[PDB]
Amino acid sequence: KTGCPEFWKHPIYKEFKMSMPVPERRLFEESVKFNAYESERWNTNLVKIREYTKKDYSEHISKSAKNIFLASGFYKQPNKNEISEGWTLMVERVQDQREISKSLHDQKPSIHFIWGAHNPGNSNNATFKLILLSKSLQSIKGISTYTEAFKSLGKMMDIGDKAIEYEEFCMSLKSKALEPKQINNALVLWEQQFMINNDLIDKSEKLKLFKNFCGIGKHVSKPKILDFDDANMYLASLTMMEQSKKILSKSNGLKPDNFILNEFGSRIKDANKETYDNMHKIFETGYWQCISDFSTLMKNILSVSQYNRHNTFRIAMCANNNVFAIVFPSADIKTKKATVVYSIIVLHKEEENIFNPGCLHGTFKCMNGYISISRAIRLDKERCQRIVSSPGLFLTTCLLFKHDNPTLVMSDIMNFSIYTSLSITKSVLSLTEPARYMIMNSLAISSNVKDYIAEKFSPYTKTLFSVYMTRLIKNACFDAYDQRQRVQLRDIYLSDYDITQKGIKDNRELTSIWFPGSVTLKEYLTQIYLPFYFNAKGLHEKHHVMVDLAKTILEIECEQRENIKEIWSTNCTKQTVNLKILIHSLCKNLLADTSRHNHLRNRIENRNNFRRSITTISTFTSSKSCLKIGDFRKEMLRNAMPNYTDYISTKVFDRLYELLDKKVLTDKPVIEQIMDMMIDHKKFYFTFFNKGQKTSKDREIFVGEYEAKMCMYAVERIAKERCKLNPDEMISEPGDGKLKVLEQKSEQEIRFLVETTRQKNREIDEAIEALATLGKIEKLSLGKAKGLKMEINADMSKWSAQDVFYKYFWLIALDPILYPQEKERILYFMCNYMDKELILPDELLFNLLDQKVAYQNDIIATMTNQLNSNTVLIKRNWLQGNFNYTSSYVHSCAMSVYKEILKEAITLLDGSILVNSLVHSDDNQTSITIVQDKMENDKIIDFAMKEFERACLTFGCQANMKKTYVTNCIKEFVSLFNLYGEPFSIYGRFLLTSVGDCAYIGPYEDLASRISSAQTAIKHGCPPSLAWVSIAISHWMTSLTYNMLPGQSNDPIDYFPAENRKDIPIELNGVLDAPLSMISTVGLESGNLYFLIKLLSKYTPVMQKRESVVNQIAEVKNWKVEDLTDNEIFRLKILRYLVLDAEMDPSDIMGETSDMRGRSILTPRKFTTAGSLRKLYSFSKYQDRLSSPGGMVELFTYLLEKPELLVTKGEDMKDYMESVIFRYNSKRFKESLSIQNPAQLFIEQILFSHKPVIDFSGIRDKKEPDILGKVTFTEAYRLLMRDLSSLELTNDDIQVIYSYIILNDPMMITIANTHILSIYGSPQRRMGMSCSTMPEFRNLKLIHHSPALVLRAYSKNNPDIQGADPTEMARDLVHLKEFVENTNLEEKMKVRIAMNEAEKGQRDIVFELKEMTRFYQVCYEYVKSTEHKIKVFILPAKSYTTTDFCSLMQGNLIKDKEWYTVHYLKQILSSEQNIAFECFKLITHFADSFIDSLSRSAFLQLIIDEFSYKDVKVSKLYDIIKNGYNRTDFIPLLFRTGDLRQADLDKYDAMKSHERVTWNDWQTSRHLDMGSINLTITGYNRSITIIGEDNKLTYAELCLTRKTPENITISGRKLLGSRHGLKFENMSKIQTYPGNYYITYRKKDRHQFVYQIHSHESITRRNEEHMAIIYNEITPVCVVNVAEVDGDQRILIRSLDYLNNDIFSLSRIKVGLDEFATIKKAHFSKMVSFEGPPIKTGLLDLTELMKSQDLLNLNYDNIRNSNLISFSKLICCEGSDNINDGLEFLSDDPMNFTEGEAIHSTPIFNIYYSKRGERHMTYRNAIKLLIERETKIFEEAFTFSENGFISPENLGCLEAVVSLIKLLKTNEWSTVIDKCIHICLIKNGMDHMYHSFDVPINWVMFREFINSLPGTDIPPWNVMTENFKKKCIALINSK
């Protein structure tokens, strides 16, 4: 209500205004006090401000536009010389900043492991291996510094011949659970653990070894890195790599048998045999053995390192009987920052057979071979996790790099993979992070690679492999610019509505970066971007990274303090803003934006709950961290500084609770509270920490106060809705819809570039081709306009740091949706935010207070007054991520200014330009297409980049040097690529993130996260086989982490009534069984769906086996629970009582909400950090209330009386407090507030493998470590199985399960129908990859609103909830209530409640509360399982309907080499007048295009009286359109049927009141101006007709009633003003002659034209006077013949029959002599919705052709070049001998065919379009030629003999194959073969012996003849026959 008068007192505002010109200060002042409600209009102030700055904006825009003439065309090209200069400068800077060491022995270990081949001779028994190690260590020959101590270690570990009592002692120690019991000169304490015997080791030797070799108790320069550019160092690195290649690439001499193979080999092989072969090769080599041995050894070292001593060491072993590791004494691994010290020892027979990655200490000659000992290695928990998880990462990297590349050798790939996966140091991060940007910029057309390399790039090479990688990067950067010219665009196949073919040609020419070989462009980009994602997180030590981040922030703030004086500049000064240009841009942008939508303020108040309560906003009541400023002494640093500000970090909701309890916040609506807080809170404090990402330099992250949180939330929500950003998307996790937005933009520029050049060069290329039947050609070719495409992928440098915060002041002051008081208070907040202070973390203060020796130039000391305080003022740096949307809006305004610059600049050259630019937080992608003829392209590019940099500097921004590059066909938005219209993404980045990043929450949590990552990768276009690889690796890693491998601790095979992990649900620690399509589309629920589908297939009669899923489910009533296998009963009980019911709680639920129950049953307990909880103010209140006489039961009663507090976490202050206190009882919500370190969660599963962790309590109440449950995994399985055996299974429960897992959600029904009814078709190659969502996804969504809102409405029983539409909640709640009533949930809940109460005698609040909690949780999960977040997919084609989407998706996920066509037997998808219109616009045009004229009417009548469309009968739709008054749109239909009336013709003539625009024929392509132009525009007493061909309008016939030139011109002007749609500008000019009238066109606006009719004298006279004085002149186009017709011309029904005696069309009839009645076309992708009885004509089936989508093209070339699989789809002869009968009914009209025309642009590409064919180009002729080719192709392909196809010897093989196909059940590739055979025998005239087949039963014969038959090479039959053979052999093996 009242404003903030304190705003005009602020020192920040005082500085802001004095920095501005006096008139600008005034205009700002009147801008602040402007009220949009109290003035005449809402734009008076904005219009005034825009007009004030109009002159200066025009001056700047013109000055920047005229700079295209001052360009020179010499931009930044990163060729070899520039790269070399940058490399030299970088070397100089690095040698300055580092201490370069040229010694080879100063290398750090590249891999902290030395390996040797396992000995086939020695045994694998632990004691024998220990004896061997001892004896070999004792016999060391030679002398060194530690040889004596090593031999003493050998002495003190021998046991002699006392092994039996040794193993007895060890076994007894293990059985009982410390005293050293000496065996033989060895004080054994445990298995493989020994006590240091001072009698066997010298004192000096022991002390020296323990202090120097291991550094145990032994306790300024520059970092010492190796010489990366030295010749000797690079040669040594090459020798190391070559030695590793030589030794590790030898075969293991084993048999690969592991979990991954035995579980997923069939799937991976049936998706790609190559991938299976690659895995089989990898598993046989020494690389996999080495990595597995190292991982197992590391696991053993971590396991045994718990209870050590100060003189004890351990001998950890592994599966390799030649590799041992000594675990030297250290701290307990499960402690804080605990390290482990070890030393690898290898015993090998012969020297140089040792893996030395720079870690070997020395190899010595012992008895019977050599012994090799590595150096001591000290590692922490995090790097140990990476070491353990390395095998999966290595396998994934190998299969990503080798996938589909015959020109890359596996050994080199595996060398790189092993040296990159086991590297746990920053040395490789410092190269992987910059290499991406460096190589991408280097390949670019224009970029700053030289500058980036020279003054930013800094390799950090402490290892030899780092030197190798640096050399590889140098070579790749040298070669990128000289190989950029090897990419070529693909031939574009566009059809004026879609681009069928687009992208980069698959030319494998580009040289591989890391490998010897050649790669394609996509593979090259993968190799560039893939190495970024191997890097580990949390490698930064806080001790150094914290001071690094502090140095960065403090240095930037010091620079801003002492170097930036002026804020507003006009010469693009860095970190300055052009004031007037900014003001004008804000005016224009706000005025444009506030015009599209009207209720903008209403949307702000509604979508952000500004009028609601504080407790209803998720961002204010979450579990995140906040900041508290105050005194926390109770909860050396304090008594050091008198200005030290105390602080603590708490949770968001806890701070909200504290604020509510202390009356700081009230129950007023949130916006009022925030508005008061804008003036109440005047000091803002922020604290920073390290994010811990994988980049070489970490990023600072700032935590703020809750008051700052509310106040910034207000501003961000005000500015967010003005942006064009989707409000359901994440800034942190950008949605995949951008990948489609990029594609749409690329298509738009592609169409613009294709059309504009053609339009401007038609006459030039015509003059050229006329001379082709010489220098004139060169002159014409130089005189034409050429095309250009540019895309500037840029990122802004210091988006949050180096920005002018003063521009947001103007942005707020110009916002008209805000009252003067609101602007006052928001500006007061902005001023106070400019005065925020950064509090240094106390860890940093401790680090800096232990210095003593002072830093030479300590900036922190200088601006903390020698650490007098810990607070630093930060003025111009708005903190990272606090102002995303406002900065995005300002960036969009800047880009609008840049677009204006480019548009004016190009109009200065009389060209055409089209610019689109996407603006995210700071990432940029601007696409520019320019067509002109004035200057060269290089000058255009130079000017574009110069003005781009200037525009960014204009608004205080600054583009990065590292991330800004320009390209001709590579668009790069946020982690997404668009390769010339074809979308592209690096799918491997998700697989690597799934393999590396693991939260270790539990088995299902990790498995679900990894499967979700695999699903996302599939959605990003991952090949199916590699997705199976990732899924298998996820399974194997999850099973290895929790000891689930067969024979381990928690293996559940022997505890469940199953036989394999396959038959066990993943919810109970099984493996997932589902085709990849279900995984991609649903995720984590595909197992249940697949099990139900398998149940249906197993237990459905054969009569309904091929029907829909609903039809087979209808038979579930006939099912019996008795005749079910125990496994199926087990899984059905699981589904009934754990998915659809809450019979067993995974954990104690008392205190839980409805949304905190997962899909898991056995959730292991996690860390409950007691220390973290004591920091919470509300936790003390919870403790006090718990320790009360009757406090808790009263709270339980209050919750029971208001059950809505379970779903809704609180909606008011009192209710929110009670709900928080209640939730503190969850025993799992306390885990979410605790510290869950992935390191200790990792070590938990290895250290404590038998500790009970699972908190399982059965069916509905039937000193210790921090992590402790009640039962172990084995006990959990046993108890759960016992409990499940106590329930009963009835057929009604099965019906309920099938009704509420499949039948409820339409998406589940659709997926089941696709899985059951799928028919696989012709193989095709991926050439037109395109993004697409699933169309009409509103109709397949069962619950429209969010599950949380639905449950809130259900709890309140109110459909009209605060934030949702009541109309949809009506249906949502009725669905939820129907679910509740049908499953018998509420009444059963009351049954147990009453039964328990009666048993106990009195009411028990706890049991009822638990029951209600289970009820709400089950309802919430049911609603949640309905929504399937199907985001955009990357499909081989474009999808128009749901069935098309499903078919494309299923065909894209069955093979890696090619994608197939999928057809469905029935309708998988199982305003009414609109359906009728679509029904007839299809069938009419279908008959005209594809049906002969003779049979057209008969086919139409058959469809009308027998077919049905979209489950509606066609007859009903025709009756509907008859009743409607829009029948005049279907005049040809009514005439052909006979239902036309004279009233219809009167109405048709009555459509002359508004000029009746009728297109007598459809243009072949109207945008490219192709097709016979036959147009008629008529009004009352006037009509015209236009005829032309593509470019030239032949003649126009005009009929009028009064032949006077004035009336002629007026009538022509009226007619041309109609919505004819014809451009009249693309048409070429025509010669003008006296005495004739010519069609003329004018340009008036920039893109608006006016067409009139004039005379030769008039046009000449006006041209000759206008040419004298841009230049808009009268251009004639077509001559007109004026005629006089006074007649009524009343169209009568009697005339139509006579007129149409020769036209048999169904979509066009001669309503007059020169005018036609037409039916609007409809796309044939929807043609599948029809369903009816088959139409058998001869041998073909029209109804199947109605379904065969691949044959619905109207292009002659596509049909003639098809495959015979389409005919196998069509054919249903049932006893025919000739094919000519069927071909008669097909059409014989001319059909379109393809032509190519080169496009003149810097990316050279050729487009292929459609054009009208000649007389012989008909559908029937294409059919005949296709048959004549493909029948012979198949016959030779399947000859299986020499005599011929018809020879009986071949007929025997055909009989065998058809018998195999028929006896064995039908497969996914069996019908096509047998129908192809039928077609070919029809062709050979031996159809009598196709229905005469029989059997030739032993499967040995079947196996033999299938295996031995040859496979064809040239025909497309190769792949399909291979698939058929593989499937049939697999199935007969299953037999």
Ligand X SMILES: Nc1ncnc2c1ncn2[C@@H]1O[C@H](COP(=O)(O)OP(=O)(O)OP(=O)(O)O)[C@@H](O)[C@H]1O
Partner RNA sequence: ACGAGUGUCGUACCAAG
Partner RNA sequence: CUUGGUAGUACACUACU
CA 129 to chain centroid: 50
By CB under 7 A, name the one of 409, 472, 1053, 1247 that touches RNA: 1247
Name the residue nearer to ligand X (CB basis): 462 or 738: 738
1068 phi and psi angles, rounded to 5 deg: -115, 40
**CB-CB contact of 1867 with 1931 (8 Å):** yes
Nearer to RNA, 73 or 727 (CB): 727
Q: Which is nearer to RNA, 41 or 1250 (CB)?
A: 1250
**Short-list 814, 690, 790, 655, CA closest to 52:** 814
Q: How far apart are CA 1456 and CA 1110, in angstroms?
A: 33
Instruction: Give the residue, chosen from 1742, 1773, 1779, 1823, that forms a contact with Zn ion under the rule CB under 5 A.
Output: 1773
Site for Zn ion in 905-924 (CB under 5 A): none
* Burial tier of 1764 (Cβ tally within 10 Å: 0-12, 13-18, 19+): buried
618 binds, among Zn ion, RNA, ligand X, none (CB under 5 to 8 A by kind): RNA
Please state the closest distance from residue 379 (CB atom) to RNA, in A. Answer: 6
Only one of the segments 880-888, 1059-1067, 1704-1712, 1891-1899 lies at the binding site for ligand X (rule: CB under 6 A); that segment is 880-888
d(CA 226, CA 838): 38
Nearer to RNA, 161 or 199 (CB): 199
Rounded CA Rg of the chain: 39
Q: Cβ 798 to ligand X, closest distance in Å?
A: 5
Q: How many CB atoms lie within 10 A of CB 1259?
A: 17
CB 777 within 8 A of CB 771: yes
Amino acid in the structure at residue 1704: F
698 binds ligand X (CB under 6 A): no
Decide whether 525 or 1873 has the Cβ nearer to Zn ion.
1873
Nearest residue by C-beta to ligand X? 881
* C-beta closer to ligand X: residue 735 or 1306: 735
Is-contact 1289 1127, C-beta < 8 A?
no
Residue 1703 sits at the vertex; the CA angle it makes with 1697 and 1706, to the nearest 5 degrees, is 90
835 labeled binding residue? no
Residue 850: contacted member of ligand X, Zn ion, RNA, none (CB under 5 to 8 Å, by partner type): RNA
Position 645 contacts RNA (CB under 7 A): no
At residue 363, what is the residue type?
T
Name which of RNA, Zn ion, ligand X, none residue 1887 binds, using a CB cut-off of 5 to 8 Å depending on partner kind: Zn ion
Cβ neighbourhood burial of 1779 (10 Å; 0-12, 13-18, 19+): buried
| Window 1609 to 1638, contacts with RNA (CB under 7 A) | none
- Point out which span in 390-398, 532-540, 975-983, 1320-1328 binds RNA (CB under 7 A): 532-540
Q: Which stretch binds ligand X (CB under 6 A): 288-296, 850-858, 879-887, 1170-1178?
A: 879-887
1668 binds RNA (CB under 7 A): no
Give the amino acid at 832: N
- Give the integer Cα–Cα distance in Å for 1691 and 1687: 11
Does 1375 appear as a known binding residue?
no
Which distant-in-sequence residues (6+ apart) come within 8 Å of 923 by Cβ?
Answer: 795, 973, 974
702: contact with RNA by CB under 7 A: yes
Start-to-end C-alpha separation, the chain: 82
Picking from 1120, 1119, 1115, 1121, the residue whose alpha carbon sits closest to that of residue 1103 is: 1115
CA dihedral 1429, 1432, 1437, 1438 (to 10 degrees): 90
Q: Is residue 1081 close enough to count as binding ligand X by CB under 6 A?
A: no
Q: Is 910 annotated as a binding residue?
A: no
Contact between 556 and ligand X by CB under 6 A: the answer reads no
Phi, psi torsion values for 1740, nearest 5 degrees? -90, 170
If one asks whether residue 108 binds RNA (CB under 7 A), the answer comes out as: yes
Going residue by residue from 548 to 577, which x/- string records binding to RNA, judged by CB under 7 A?
x--x--------------------------
Q: 502 or 963, CB closer to ligand X?
A: 963
Give whichever of 553 and 1095 is closer to ligand X, judged by the CB atom.
553
Is 1891 assigned to a binding site?
A: yes
Q: Does 1108 participate in binding ligand X (rule CB under 6 A)? A: no
Q: How far apart are CA 1746 and CA 1769, in angstroms?
A: 11
Q: By CB under 7 A, which span of 265-273, 1230-1238, 1286-1294, 1600-1608 interacts with RNA?
A: 1230-1238
Count H helices, E strands: the chain? Answer: 72, 49
Contact between 806 and 577 (Cβ < 8 Å): yes
1088-1127 in b/e burial notation, b at 16+ Cβ within 10 A? bbbbbbebbeebbeeeeeebbbeebbbebeebeeeebeeb
Strand partners, 314: 193, 327
β-partners of residue 1271 are 1254
Question: Is 696 one of the binding residues for ligand X (CB under 6 A)?
Answer: no
Q: What are phi and psi of 1465, to 5 degrees?
A: -65, -45
Judged by CB under 5 A, the chain residues 1862 through 1891 that form the site for Zn ion are 1887
Which span sits near RNA by CB under 7 A: 500-508, 587-595, 780-788, 852-860? 852-860
Sign of the torsion formed by the C-alpha atoms of 1873, 1878, 1883 and 1884: positive
Q: What residues numbered 759-798 form the site for ligand X, per CB under 6 A?
A: 795-798
Contact partner at residue 1773 from RNA, ligand X, Zn ion, none, CB < 5 to 8 Å by partner kind: Zn ion
198 exposure class (CB count in 10 Å sphere: 0-12, 13-18, 19+): exposed
733 binds, among Zn ion, RNA, ligand X, none (CB under 5 to 8 A by kind): RNA
Kindly tell me which of 798 and 1613 has the beta carbon lying closer to ligand X.
798
Q: Which of 360, 410, 472, 547 binds RNA (CB under 7 A)?
A: 547
Q: What length is written for the chain?
A: 1935
Strand positions, DSSP E, 448-543: 492-494, 499-501, 510-511, 518-519
Of the pair 454, 1873, the CB lying nearest RNA is at 454
Site for ligand X in 951-990 (CB under 6 A): 960
Q: Which of 518, 552, 649, 1663 binds RNA (CB under 7 A)?
A: 649
Closest approach of RNA to the CB of residue 1181, in Å = 20
Least CB distance to Zn ion at residue 1881 (A): 8
Q: Does 641 bind RNA (CB under 7 A)?
A: no
Q: Which does 704 bind (CB under 5 to 8 A by kind): RNA, Zn ion, ligand X, none?
A: RNA
For 1848-1916, where are the alpha helices, taking DSSP H only? 1848-1863, 1871-1883, 1899-1908
Total residues contacting ligand X by CB under 6 A comes to 15
Query: Does 1578 contact ligand X by CB under 6 A?
Result: no
> Between 690 and 797, whose beta carbon lies closer to ligand X?
797
1173/1311 with CB nearer RNA: 1173
Find the binder of ligand X among 136, 527, 613, 921 (CB under 6 A).
921
Lookup result for tokens 């070397």: 91
- Minimum Å gap between C-beta 1250 and RNA is 12
E strand or H helix at 181: strand 181-182
Determine whether the annotation assigns residue 1878 to a binding site: yes
Closest CB 856 distance from RNA, rounded Å: 7
Residues in 305-324 at the binding interface with ligand X, rule: CB under 6 A:
none
Does 1228 sit near RNA (CB under 7 A)?
no
Question: Binding site membership: which residues?
Answer: 923, 1773, 1878, 1887, 1891
Question: Binding site membership for Mg(2+): which residues?
Answer: 923
Interface positions with Zn ion (CB under 5 A): 1773, 1775, 1887
Interface positions with ligand X (CB under 6 A): 691, 701, 795-801, 880-881, 884, 921-922, 960
Question: Binding site membership for Zn(2+): which residues?
Answer: 1773, 1878, 1887, 1891
